[PDB]
Design a protein around this ligand. Structure first.
Ligand SMILES: [K+]
Ligand SMILES: [K+]
Ligand SMILES: [Zn+2]
Length: 405
């Protein structure tokens, strides 16, 4: 019944301290506040640690000591306004702490804050304080063991899932971001207990290039060892709309829930599939009568499985706030059974000016038409799900699953 959301004063400051995402988190939490949702939500405080040793122990559950050390040293150098020595440039380069993942004065505290948020969110599900927890400061799916990638420095998702599986525990991870959830997929590549499902754009030279047919004829990789068939991917061509994306993923989600019977669901809800994201690749909306995002979240919540909802990508800050406000309101409705009426007019607040010139909740887009490739992927995914079920000796109505598709 209880819906948790991660916020706090320091957390807000840190989530708003990065050059790439600026004040997006402030717009998200202030639009949620403006629509009077905060009293319906349980504040989940970010996790803090008893010592540096305890913080390091927690982060190095996934990340390497040398990577965490390099990330902490990058923050120190950007704070002293020290020019990096040639030696320091090579160190940072070795961890990809450069180009799209640059240093900045708060890079470690900013990155860690996401981990603090998503770990606290996982704990609140484990002790059953909340049935769903939202962290709009998390979702950094690209970060690897020893590599920064796609403005992801620490993988708050991997650390949250590790806490859930450590708490027979199975986790279904659903990645709705425009980009492939490569970092989360890789971390659990060998585990049958964490099934990863990413739906994303893939095309030649599009970041990160995984989650699709790869040269090793190209083959579709899907995990290894005990984790064989446990990594699911739906790559989609540009231009897909709400209905087609919904019809593409809906049967996959329902089939994974039926076969896996997850103890926890973790959803990455990156907003860069919106028609108005500057990426301009997918044509998803935040519309509610239907938004692909809201269709997906409503389906996942209907399973009544303890669920972690995270952010991620989303480069139109006002449209990201607009979508994540509706996801939050939908979450309250579905979990609490309490209808939350949201005025189509953006309420007056701190950031009202940023919603111009229309100042409406619906993103300013008129959907039109975007099927063949989806059917091929459906046959391949249904096949892979059977192989996953067979390998792990899982019992399920094959016909019931076939019928979803
Ligand atoms: K994705
Ligand atoms: K896996
Ligand atoms: Zn993205």
């Amino acid at each position: 019944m209880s819906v948790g959301i991660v916020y706090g004063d320091q957390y807000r400051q840190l989530c708003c301290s990065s050059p790439k995402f600026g004040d997006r988190y402030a717009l998200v939490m202030d639009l949620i506040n403006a629509y009077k949702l905060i009293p319906e939500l349980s504040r989940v405080p970010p996790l803090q640690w008893d010592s540096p040793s305890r913080m390091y122990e927690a982060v190095t559950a996934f990340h390497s000591t040398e990577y965490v050390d390099a990330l902490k040293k990058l923050q120190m150098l950007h704070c002293e306004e020290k020019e990096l020595t040639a030696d320091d440039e090579l160190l940072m380069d070795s961890f990809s702490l450069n180009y799209d993942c640059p240093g900045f004065p708060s890079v470690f505290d900013y990155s860690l804050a996401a981990v603090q948020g998503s770990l606290a969110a996982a704990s609140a599900l484990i002790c059953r304080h909340c049935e769903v927890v939202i962290n709009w400061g998390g979702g950094w799916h690209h970060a690897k063991r020893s590599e920064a990638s796609g403005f992801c420095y620490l993988n708050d998702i991997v650390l949250a899932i590790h806490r859930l599986v450590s708490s027979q525990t199975r986790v279904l991870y659903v990645d709705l971001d425009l980009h492939h959830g490569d970092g989360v997929e890789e971390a659990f590549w060998y585990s049958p207990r964490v099934v990863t499902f990413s739906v994303h754009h893939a095309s030649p030279g599009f970041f990160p290039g995984t989650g699709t047919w790869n040269m090793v004829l190209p083959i579709f990789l899907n995990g290894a060892g005990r984790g064989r068939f446990s990594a699911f991917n739906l790559p989609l061509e540009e231009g897909i709309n709400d209905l087609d994306w919904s019809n593409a993923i809906g049967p996959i989600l329902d089939s994974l829930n039926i076969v896996i019977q997850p103890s926890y669901v973790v959803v990455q809800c990156g907003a860069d599939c919106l028609a108005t994201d500057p990426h301009r690749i997918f044509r998803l909306t935040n519309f509610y009568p239907l938004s692909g995002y809201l269709y997906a979240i409503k389906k996942i919540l209907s399973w009544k499985v303890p669920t972690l909802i995270l952010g991620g990508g989303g480069y139109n800050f006002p449209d990201t706030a607009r979508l994540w406000t509706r996801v939050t309101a939908l979450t309250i409705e579905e979990v609490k059974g309490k209808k939350m009426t949201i005025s189509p007019e953006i309420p007056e607040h701190s950031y009202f000016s940023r919603y111009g010139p229309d100042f409406e909740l619906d993103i300013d887009y008129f959907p039109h038409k975007s099927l063949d490739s989806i059917q091929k992927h459906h046959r391949r995914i249904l096949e892979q799900l059977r192989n996953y079920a067979d390998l792990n000796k899982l019992i399920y109505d094959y016909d019931q699953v076939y019928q979803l598709y």
